[PDB]
Design a protein around this ligand. Structure first.
Ligand SMILES: NC(=O)c1ccc[n+]([C@@H]2O[C@H](COP(=O)([O-])OP(=O)(O)OC[C@H]3O[C@@H](n4cnc5c(N)ncnc54)[C@H](O)[C@@H]3O)[C@@H](O)[C@H]2O)c1
Ligand SMILES: NC(=O)c1ccc[n+]([C@@H]2O[C@H](COP(=O)([O-])OP(=O)(O)OC[C@H]3O[C@@H](n4cnc5c(N)ncnc54)[C@H](O)[C@@H]3O)[C@@H](O)[C@H]2O)c1
Ligand SMILES: NC(=O)c1ccc[n+]([C@@H]2O[C@H](COP(=O)([O-])OP(=O)(O)OC[C@H]3O[C@@H](n4cnc5c(N)ncnc54)[C@H](O)[C@@H]3O)[C@@H](O)[C@H]2O)c1
Ligand SMILES: NC(=O)c1ccc[n+]([C@@H]2O[C@H](COP(=O)([O-])OP(=O)(O)OC[C@H]3O[C@@H](n4cnc5c(N)ncnc54)[C@H](O)[C@@H]3O)[C@@H](O)[C@H]2O)c1
Ligand SMILES: [Mg+2]
Ligand SMILES: [Mg+2]
Ligand SMILES: [Mg+2]
Ligand SMILES: [Mg+2]
Lengths: 334, 334, 329, 319
């Protein structure tokens, strides 16, 4: 299956990197808003994720990656990308500006692509897939799908384990997040109207909103309407952590919650009892990584509050799932 | 006019000195650290996070002058061997962070010593801990050793007490997103305290850590003894922190009633704001805590409620403002 | 004199702050690309420079600052700003997009302003205050307050010339990161493969014209200096090193010479300060005696002199001084 | 075998490299803390990444891919019984960087009295020396760049400026510096901080023909690792292209070459001692007189450590 990337940014470029070690999926075209020399440089060198494991050499209208040429273009409007020229069936929409069924669908047309995977929430009329949590829902007939938020991919397997063992009454999330491209490097007008993302992202603790908690219902229906949360963006260029304080149906101890998470561990959901820090989870392939050292169960007058926390690298952790769901989606084509 | 001595001319020590200049009834006449006067004079005049000193500091022999008035300096490691009486100092600010107990702080009190001591940190349960404008009434003036509590307790106290005196709290879990501090390593190296996370580079990591402030709230507000607990997330900002508290309350509430309740409880120590500020905005403030209405949450799921309240504090200056207020009040009733 | 600001950014907002404590010049309109609520918030709160010393409350089409409504607009083209409506004679061009004779002149029009001062870099007089402020007569439509680095380098280099004379020199400025860098690795619209990189997590080399275009300020050094930059992770505050061949000198004569040249713009210090210490200062440049070097090897000499400056406030202080002087004449 | 005194940044990274070298093998570590602390700091590394292996803590040590390594906590090196594990020592504490105190058992991982850069003056060693030094991080960078300038064009005099990452000897926040330095007292990760550097003047001990001709200072900046060295010099000869070409010729395993516009993060964890950057080369000719500027990257941690291990390997060979 031949794939195209619209938006060769952080998620776009890292997705490309992971596609190299996945047989049966292959990127043959990239579309951004800049010349090929810029994109080749940004693939080779990466501040947070390290230099590229390969060779990248710039050509005309593209660059070669270990010998295979990949065409690049600078088409701003998705309608005008001739995806069909390079046989691209599926497009990774990673611009962050066409994160809806309506605007993503402008990739699908004559001389266009068949299907689209948005690298972000895509609205409620689009299927939202956290791999190894609800990828079963996919049948292969969907024109537009979404890989969810970075925070949802983290929160899902941790919350799902709580439900399938103890059941959850309600919960409040707090994610301590790395700063991202949508923040200003220094104090300046934010085009999105946010008075906090306007502030210097790398020199401040800056609060902000996140839909991941409320829109969990679309991934795990049994938790619909039960959660809500906010974010605190802090000065690290990548790597985040999600805290969840919840009330559970049953009564629990610290050891049963940790043990329950260990059982639920897989390729996406990790487990650790080492006292790691944010830099330790940079570039990991797990979507989320439960940290047993931070588990709390506070019993006061029979009532219990449970706190569970899990790490995730917003960049690579999410990208790992986006690629897994892309691989699975490409196979059941149709 | 009560004359004071500083043991430990560090972050809290130096800032305390700065604030004591604009308080008439108290005046510092001696400083004791582990270095020459030229080092301490430089660190008073120039301050990365808090700005240059508002005055003139010139180095003399065995001290330095501040706006004319000479202050003696010494380099005595043992508190027992400081001749505090030579400079008439009745009260000592213990800001080394090594003598934070009744027993070890008491080594300031002796012949050729001081009369009383204020520890700039938790000092144990056999020592009264004072959060100013929350429980300073408890003091009578006869106490040899007292404590100004933690930076986080001074923040959490007025926010939690307001919740109790309006709605009552069943239980609560705290999360503080804290600035990095001197007890962390600048880069990955052996921590003398045995902490495998404070061993890590403090300014390049989200680093989880423990905090007693939440549980030891009982010593400040007895009606909340044993009801709270929490953890910390140290993040790369050199000063400025924020405290989140998720709690279950006796009454039912709305967002507006909790904000309004905090506004009522506001004073010189407990601030209030509805502006969407960030961490740098609270650097060098005089309020102990500053409630942020924009971050308030009240989540109703199936009749049950969870309440989230958040407040800023500058671990350095916010705490120091209370430490000085408690010092002023204590000096008067001696 | 009534003034307007086009581009309420770092330099724009700080200029506004300093204009409050100068009587006889006064801002009556701001033009940017966003609503008034955004600009009011960014004036009140400032990460690097501290909270505003005043009161700001948002109204319609503007905000009040200690009283007196100040209009705000979101006009993209300079041609289409009706500056005359609010009586603004002079405009601060701080967008960083109209730094030329032709494009700055689109402020000067029938519905518009009389004159313009661009907040950056030859058809235009380039003025570093207390270094070549003489040059203005008051009849110039467009002028420029030079770069942040030029305002720093000028008084340090001029002192070297007026005492010892300069053969040639190479500059290295260790600069704070700025808004033209990417917060994270992404395509730079300007095509720079280094400002494309995460500005706050890298030492990033970059070019700087300030060194060569010294001739425009002080003709006596024209063509003899050149330099580059190293952008480093601090949100504001920079330092300029200059290694030069000059008479023969000692360390003490160079320091003493700089102290003599000190004034309101050119500072002097012998304290071992660091970048955070110079944040928000009013001096354009601040010579640091502790870093002076004079290396004599086989009769030949190399001289190294270093001076701090806060790209933001240091420069802004001069821009406002030049604006004040220009408004009078 | 080798033993490590000071399992810090340079100590631990040296250990890491020692795994991918046959004929050298570390069997003892001595620091000032328990084995559990050192095992954690080997497994996890903020700047250099997680350890490529398996680490499990035991009694008085920890196992690395099955083989136990002893650990001890002796402050005075005289009383470390190195002979117990057959060690024929990397002095990486930074407190015993002298003939007298290092001799008290050696390769010092830092700077007259002792031999001082692999592939630049490795010939000097014969194998009979009790005390030798791997030089500074900055010298290992500057040496192959300066040596190339001499062996092609010859240099009159030069002034160095190194933009350096912050290091463990700086304070995390403003506080009294043990060493009395009023600038390393300041918050290392929130400031441009000027500092002194011997590397430039003490180049004579590595390249004698340059003795007394160079000098420089440092600017410490907020990055946890990765540095760059600028050198402005006047040469004996009278273009940009010949200097770049000359460096390319001098390139080897230690001295790298690049014409890509990289930044500090790109050189983190590299094995080259120095990496010449052609994009930053300048030659300014004004009135017949010339000034030449040449710049080269180095990761103070791993770049230096790569040489320290290479010189350790070579030194072990000719014992
Ligand atoms: N960065 C993260 O941590 C993270 C995590 C989860 C998902 N995401 C999502 O991934 C997407 C990309 O985020 P990112 O961090 O990579 O952002 P980014 O800014 O790094 O990526 C944007 C890229 O798209 C390009 N672009 C912009 N407008 C375009 C247009 N009209 N047509 C084509 N290309 C255009 C940009 O030049 C750049 O190459 C967003 O939807 C974001 O929400 C990001
Ligand atoms: N930093 C904060 O935000 C904060 C907030 C509240 C409480 N505190 C408490 O304040 C105290 C000081 O913390 P800090 O951040 O100012 O630390 P710091 O490390 O900046 O201050 C310590 C100072 O004490 C000196 N010192 C060490 N041992 C000494 C001794 N035996 N005799 C004399 N001086 C000695 C050090 O040299 C240094 O000058 C600690 O108890 C800390 O827990 C700090
Ligand atoms: N940044 C510094 O420290 C510094 C130092 C020297 C000189 N300068 C120069 O000053 C200028 C301003 O740069 P800055 O650092 O303030 O950047 P900035 O990002 O703060 O300025 C950008 C501002 O201009 C506004 N803007 C953009 N396009 C506009 C348009 N068409 N119409 C109206 N407003 C528009 C933006 O919304 C924003 O408010 C640049 O030329 C810069 O080189 C600044
Ligand atoms: N990393 C660099 O930038 C760099 C550059 C070149 C060489 N070096 C040199 O290497 C040496 C180590 O520096 P580092 O960066 O690894 O520092 P570090 O602080 O990370 O390493 C110090 C280690 O030695 C231990 N130690 C201290 N005193 C000891 C004693 N008396 N006995 C035993 N162990 C003791 C410490 O606890 C710690 O484990 C210094 O001389 C330094 O100048 C480092
Ligand atoms: Mg492939
Ligand atoms: Mg006083
Ligand atoms: Mg005015
Ligand atoms: Mg080996």
């Amino acid at each position: 299956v031949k794939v195209g990337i619209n938006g060769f940014g952080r998620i776009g470029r890292l997705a490309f990197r992971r596609i190299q070690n996945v047989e049966g999926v292959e990127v043959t075209r990239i579309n951004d808003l800049t010349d090929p020399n810029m994109l080749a440089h940004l693939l080779k060198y990466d501040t947070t994720q390290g230099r590229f494991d390969g060779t990248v050499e710039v050509k005309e209208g593209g660059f070669e990656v270990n010998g295979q040429f990949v065409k690049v273009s600078a088409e701003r409007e998705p309608a005008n990308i001739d995806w069909a020229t390079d046989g691209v069936e599926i497009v990774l929409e990673a611009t962050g500006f066409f994160a809806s069924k309506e605007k993503a669908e402008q990739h699908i047309h004559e001389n266009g692509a068949k299907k689209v995977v948005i690298t972000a929430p895509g609205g409620n009329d689009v299927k939202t897939v956290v791999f190894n949590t609800n990828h079963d829902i996919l049948d292969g007939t969907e024109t537009v799908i979404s890989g969810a938020s970075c925070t949802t991919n983290c929160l899902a397997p941790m919350a799902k384990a709580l439900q399938d063992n103890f059941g959850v009454k309600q919960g409040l999330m707090t994610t301590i997040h790395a700063y991202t491209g949508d923040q200003m490097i220094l104090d300046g007008p934010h085009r999105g109207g946010d008075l906090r993302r306007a502030r210097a992202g790398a020199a401040n603790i800056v609060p902000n909103s996140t839909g991941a908690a409320k829109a969990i219902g679309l991934v795990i229906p049994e938790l619909n309407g039960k959660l809500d949360g906010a974010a605190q963006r802090v000065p690290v260029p990548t790597g985040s952590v999600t805290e969840l304080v919840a009330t559970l149906e049953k009564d629990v101890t610290v050891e049963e919650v940790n043990a329950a998470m260990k059982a639920a561990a897989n390729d996406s959901y990790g487990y650790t009892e080492d006292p790691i820090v944010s830099s330790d989870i940079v570039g990991i392939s797990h979507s989320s990584l439960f940290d047993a050292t931070q588990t709390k169960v506070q019993t006061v007058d029979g009532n219990q509050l449970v706190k569970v926390v899990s790490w995730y690298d917003n960049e690579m952790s999410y990208t790992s799932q986006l690629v897994r769901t892309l691989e699975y989606f490409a196979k059941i084509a149709k």
